[PDB]
Amino acid sequence: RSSSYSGEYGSGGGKRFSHSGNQLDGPITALRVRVNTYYIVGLQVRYGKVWSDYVGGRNGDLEEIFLHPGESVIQVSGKYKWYLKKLVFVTDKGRYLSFGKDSGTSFNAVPLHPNTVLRFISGRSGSLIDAIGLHWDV
Ligand SMILES: CO[C@H]1O[C@H](CO)[C@@H](O)[C@H](O)[C@@H]1O
Ligand SMILES: [Cl-]
Numbered sequence: 001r002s003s004s005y006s007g008e009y010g011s012g013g014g015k016r017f018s019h020s021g022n023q024l025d026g027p028i029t030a031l032r033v034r035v036n037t038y039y040i041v042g043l044q045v046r047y048g049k050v051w052s053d054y055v056g057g058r059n060g061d062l063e064e065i066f067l068h069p070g071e072s073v074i075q076v077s078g079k080y081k082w083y084l085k086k087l088v089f090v091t092d093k094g095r096y097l098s099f100g101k102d103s104g105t106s107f108n109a110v111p112l113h114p115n116t117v118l119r120f121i122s123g124r125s126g127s128l129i130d131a132i133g134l135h136w137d138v
């Protein structure tokens with residue numbers, strides 16, 4: 001196996017979600033994060049040309065970053081309490097795509113195996129993002 005899973009970061013509230021099928025549409029090309037005063041409310045990830053189903057709640061402001069062609073995520077750090085509060089996507093182009101608020105329990109996620117990148121994300125959500133899981137592969 002060249003695949004790995006960083007997680008789960010957050011708590012066990014709400015229902016679960018997986019973007020496992022979405023990796024068939026392509027690599028991660030853009031990111032959507034909805035953040036409010038304290039939490040990360042919602043997530044949406046663009047695989048190839050296709051956006052995923054929105055997960056989370058409505059109580060926040062939409063933030064959106066497109067990735068450069070051939071750019072992939074190689075590290076993910078963040079913060080959480082019972083709910084996810086911060087997310088930072090580090091890309092191989094050396095960019096730091098920070099979303100959310102600077103407070104809580106920190107985590108730092110890197111792939112296990114050689115030359116692997118973030119392929120899809122999992123986690124739990126309700127009206128906020130309870131938990132996130134990071135999936136790595138070639
Ligand atoms: C209002 O509560 C809802 O949203 C929170 C945050 O996502 C979840 O923990 C919970 O299970 C419910 O789905
Ligand atoms: Cl930057």
Ligand SMILES: [Cl-]
Pocket residue numbers: 106107108
């Ligand atoms: Cl950390």
